[model samples]
Target chain A: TTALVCDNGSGLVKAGFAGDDAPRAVFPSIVGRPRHQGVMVGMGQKDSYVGDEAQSKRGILTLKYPIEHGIITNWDDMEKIWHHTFYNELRVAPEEHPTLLTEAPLNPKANREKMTQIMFETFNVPAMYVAIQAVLSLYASGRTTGIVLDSGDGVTHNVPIYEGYALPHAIMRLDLAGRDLTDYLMKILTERGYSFVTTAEREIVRDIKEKLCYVALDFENEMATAASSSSLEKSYELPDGQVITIGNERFRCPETLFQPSFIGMESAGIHETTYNSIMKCDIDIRKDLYANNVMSGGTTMYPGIADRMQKEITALAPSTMKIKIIAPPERKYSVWIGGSILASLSTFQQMWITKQEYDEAGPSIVH
Target chain B: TTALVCDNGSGLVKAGFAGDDAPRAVFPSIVGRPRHQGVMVGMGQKDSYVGDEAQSKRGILTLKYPIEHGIITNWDDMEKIWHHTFYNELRVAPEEHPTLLTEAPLNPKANREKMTQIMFETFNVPAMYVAIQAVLSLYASGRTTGIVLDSGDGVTHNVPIYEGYALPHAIMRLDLAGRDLTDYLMKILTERGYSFVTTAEREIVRDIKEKLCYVALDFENEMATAASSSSLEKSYELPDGQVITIGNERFRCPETLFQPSFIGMESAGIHETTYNSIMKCDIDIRKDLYANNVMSGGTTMYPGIADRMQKEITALAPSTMKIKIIAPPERKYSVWIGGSILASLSTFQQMWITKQEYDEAGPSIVH
Candidate 1:
């Protein structure tokens, strides 16, 4: 038996076999046209096989993105890419293998049904398991009662897994993620007089953000310092050898996770929004889930993020309640690990609704 | 006495006396500094006042704006520019004769008081009169009862002048102006893969918009045609020598004035917003004003602007009502002409409130 997993954020797609040491492929969610003719695919790879490399040929190749806002918006174009990706990279030949696909939580039913039809008709997989990435990460972490934080390229999702299943009432989704952060960087670059000829500027900014940007523990104090004319705040050097400094300011970037107001949207910040979601669940479930908080996802790599989360969450929880931050060893790969672990379980075999069930029962009946 | 009239927008400042054949001086609204210097003023003489010049001299100079949101946001900086501009260009001493200055309608009273105080204390003029530009433009046009549209670099302010005085209730202000239009252009450029390097990108796009963009009379049909791949549309060569053909296309640049939502703002377009403002006035006043509808300001210079306004406003008004588009002979200087005409009227002198009245009444009494 084999399992494949894919998560398409607004900015990138992360996909691979569940048990693979690393993702078989990673690519930017964007596609574009070349200067002369033809279309380019993928994001960072030097060769256009499965991932990033295909994205490099953007302007010279007509580009397209199949999914937008976590759902497939361009099915016809997506089908072409899916076929090329699977046939060229996976070498599956569509003759065999089972597949597991991840999607956003509470996705529109219409989109889900369309996706199911596409997968069944196009891939010819023997079996399939459809679930949210947050759920898979929770299963991977071996924690049946902890929160799972899944921050990818474009948006962030927080889900609490209880008794080996996602507590829908405990899940919260925010519109800030790596792609938005990168866009903010691009805006800053525009103000600072930097030219963006290619994805290099975005990549450089992303690197700087990962390397120097931090979550301020005392947000107001940090913002005050950053706002002040202080030399102690952090800054980074661009690839062009220019040093750009940012003050140890408030949790400007991290604060976006909580407050959408900074971007001119009226939204409750992270803690309040998350609290609202958690409170919607059964009181017992909330208490049990609050006891053990799990942090996973690419963004979890930010230094001091766990500390900031713990501090903020603790203040909101009952004063007497104990809270702990469970950090996965490989934070970025935790979801993949969760998928792998689930596949390793004998009982997990029953969790998958077989192809026969999908055909006979149909999607509407199954849902 | 020779009078110098200066009009400054977010992009440029033009100055000249009433009798001058053309503007005596012009400067881009940007200041630059050398890498290690304090500030460099006046290099704009050679079109050097743009973004790159500012970037190279950033360390020496701080960029400043005379007006923000159609009103003075920084008086100290404005005063500095005022002194330098007059002293160097016009060679007018601070102890010169009386001066008449133009301001936007409903200008902040605090800002107005401060400005008057600054002129009295710093310039030491014998006397000064502050008049609204739109009202002055109407006076210059010799239209005692007509709607005045002052569409300039930063904002387009509409004022109804009835029997030689501005009707305060009939005035309308919207954030959708030239600067906003430039911003929309920059966003479109970014989406088209042209990343901005400086705030000057706004200025460059403004120039392009001025040369090649126009309001489409029928938006849906025009946009549909332009967006289509048909070859019937016209293409123009940009300043950079790149040819872009657009036919029956919706003017992407001008469309923003009608639908600010494209820029993610809650504000409505200029047309609907203007109609709403007009509706707020007395119906009789609106009917009389609509007969002599005036379009002024820098933005009104776009070709076909009057035609578009006539078409849109006609559709919005009652069937019994007739609408007209009044184009100023010298659209750019109509505001100054209006101010000059106001100065020429002895009766208008009565409307000039002195420092005594201002002090006794307090700044808040303007309304």
Candidate 2:
């Protein structure tokens, strides 16, 4: 009697319930308010915030992000982050369980019939399913066919999948990710003058682009030894005190995901978008989508970005295939731990749709 | 005590109040429900419908459209089409007046601070503004600068507007409109032997493409006299009684708004998107945006779409300048009578934004 999952994303949401091993309400899908508050004291009855208490009221409050590239463009700030993740983070009771969720690949068959009419008509829940975040990040890497790639925080796709379906014309996307490398690390650190103008200094340049960026395995010899290696520099300390320096703007802000013309974006590049999404599939599933590529989201958790995306997709693949890149360690909550291992399957509880197949096959039976 | 307006659009909403001379809640910005109910009752406490009673439950419910191209991607079916235009079409009381709305043209500045945190935090209204539907269809044609183009029913833009602002780099858009010429007139009338196959026969092929389309002033002699001129065919009928006909899918569905390659879309049409948005503006306001083109929405009400858009923008403008068009005999309620003449301006009463300046210059003081 489980099922609840969630996932969400455009910069976090993950949720809980379904025999979960992780995701007991992560957060940051944004939504805040305050900043001056008085139009006759109507903050829609005051106190708005949400998720990490709306990123701890960044600069007094304003936030927003009710999903963008990952879709849900504000259903009243996504029903106040799914009504504060079902009554304040999983305290539960949406007609008691069975939900799942996921979305964002092609998403928009009228956004899965309005997320199955907001889970059977506005959280009366009871039963649901939805699926698809790159087939739940390729079923949390235990696999059901391959090639996910992902790259989260607002976009970057690839997809492919196979057994569990997906592969819509070998899907591919880019809308640049990790909130566009945190606005290209606040525009090359405000071109070295150190000026992330505030919303808590742009949330500390998205926590210094997720902890001092990476992924350089020789990007032109680390931009010519980070232009005179002051020991390939790095520094931070800001919450007002000062200290900045971060040479070669942390591998030129993750080489704009492998040179998206380092930001003037003209697409392609998570290794030629996973080698043109495994040459648009089906040629015998291109050696199991190049030996199962995978590596899901949170901007593919930098470091050496799965060895620079398996050495730029094995230098543009087909050197007799065999590439392999996986990168799991809970690849940033692999699409909510693949919907918490497929809603803690008891043979996926006869693949949920129920509410009596949604009041008898209506919400376009969630496709 | 005026101010209410609304506009909305991606296929109509309009609304009322403010010196209304039109739009006492026009409808169709969708929402419905039924199509078989009962997972133990709870269609969110029953009855969903909205706007024209959700287009009179076409084929007994499902519908949806919580605004797409024109934005508001489902704030719960846009708060059930703004709570059925405030209690069954303008019965009023969103905390008494002051609303306005409009949006679109390059929207996203966090959609005007979440439509100013939902009209002062969830319809508590009182004072607000929004603006920009091509500067309220160039302020209901008593202009403040030129070129709007519009198109509507999902998307098509041109914009330009100078003095009353909107000139974000020669705006141009297309995502095809009038629900893609009613699915290219149900794909050239399903290449002949009828079959619109249900949702009330695909809404009678969108009322046979808005009552038999137009815009052709010699599109190759109206496609060689609508391919064998049987008195340039017409017919329609359908609700079980047959008749079908139509011909050169009525000027090939408004020549996909001036040949968006007759649907395979490669962009640029509406007279090269209003002559590449007046060759990207400023050359002394490209002859007042080529003599105030204007036109507005509802798929620019075809009938030689403003003389085939001023002869394809005088074959891409500049040949001794001039080339006007206007077309507004209430261009589909010119963006709600230009927000009912700028919220019935009494010098636009200190340009609204009240509710105590949204409790103190917040919601990013709506830019």
Cα RMSDs, all models: 28.2, 25.6
Give the alpha-carbon lDDT of every model. Answer: 0.62, 0.70
Residue A130 error, candidate 1, Å: 1.1
Clashing pairs in 2: A37-B359, A38-B359, A39-B355, A39-B359
lDDT tens readout by residue for model 2, B1-367 = 5667877676776777765578776766666676874676544544766656556557777776677766777466666567667887678888887777767766556866776686567778778777667667666787666777777777767766554444556677777877877877777787886756654456667766777767777688877866673677777677659786666667767777777777776776777767666655433346566677778777677677677777766665544566767777868888887777666656646756888877887786565
* lDDT for each residue of candidate 1 in B237-307, tens digit (9 for 90 to 100): 65568765443322777777776776777877656756776665433245566768777777878776787
Where is the poorest 10-residue window by lDDT in model 1 chain A?
A37-46
How far off is each candidate at the interface, as Cα RMSD in Å?
30.7, 18.8
Q: Give the winner by TM-score.
A: 1
Please report the TM-score between candidate 1 and the true structure. 0.45
**For candidate 2, lDDT tens digit of each residue in A153-180?**
7676777767867667878777877777
Q: Specify the CAPRI tier of model 2.
A: incorrect
Instruction: Give model 2 RMSD, 1 decimal.
Output: 25.6
